[PDB]
């Protein structure tokens, strides 16, 4: 079973520099493509960013335009989210999921995820 | 709906390759051209110095 976990969550002002972390032990981080999830409060779920495995490339949605950059983590097999510049429409908790095995591309829907982690809260205020 | 009830277009690539006359390729870009200069040069029959 995978302990998929994923922590660093606070209230912050506009434009604060907070990361994320995910955990990922039992399968394999090292090969796995893998994305980034939230569940918008009176929305629906929505991607957030992705990679693949020796980050040769990179892909986010339409309003995370110059918010985000996704890297790897190899100490530990951990991705981070370096993100900036908030937005007040940002809160929700983070998760990062798992996919089969990749050779190249982008992909970004919820539910081609088949797994999903503990998450965190994010927030933003002005 | 959500994501999972929203309609999906979907198009994928399937690549015959098998040796034949192969009519489709990808589009190949060309170097400026220089003149009266010792140069390393590159022609789609041939290559040479």
């Known amino acids: 079973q995978v302990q998929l976990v994923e922590s660093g969550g606070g209230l912050v002002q506009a434009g604060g520099s907070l990361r994320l972390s995910c955990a990922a032990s039992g399968r394999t981080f090292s090969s796995y493509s893998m994305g980034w999830f939230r569940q918008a409060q009176g929305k629906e779920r929505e991607f957030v960013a992705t990679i693949n495995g020796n980050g040769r490339d990179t892909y986010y949605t339409n309003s995370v335009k110059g918010r985000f950059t996704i890297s790897r983590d190899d100490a530990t097999n951990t991705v981070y989210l370096q993100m900036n510049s908030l937005k007040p429409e940002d809160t929700a908790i983070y998760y990062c999921?798992?996919?089969?095995?990749?050779?190249?591309?982008?992909?970004?829907?919820?539910?081609?995820?088949?797994?999903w982690g503990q998450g965190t809260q994010v927030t933003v205020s002005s | 709906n959500g994501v999972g009830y929203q309609p999906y277009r979907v198009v994928v690539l399937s690549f015959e390759l098998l040796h034949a006359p192969a009519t489709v390729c990808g589009p190949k870009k060309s170097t400026n051209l220089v003149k009266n200069k010792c140069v390393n040069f590159n022609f789609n029959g041939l290559t040479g110095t």
């Open positions: 999921a798992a996919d089969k095995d990749v050779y190249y591309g982008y992909t970004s829907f919820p539910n081609e995820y088949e797994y």
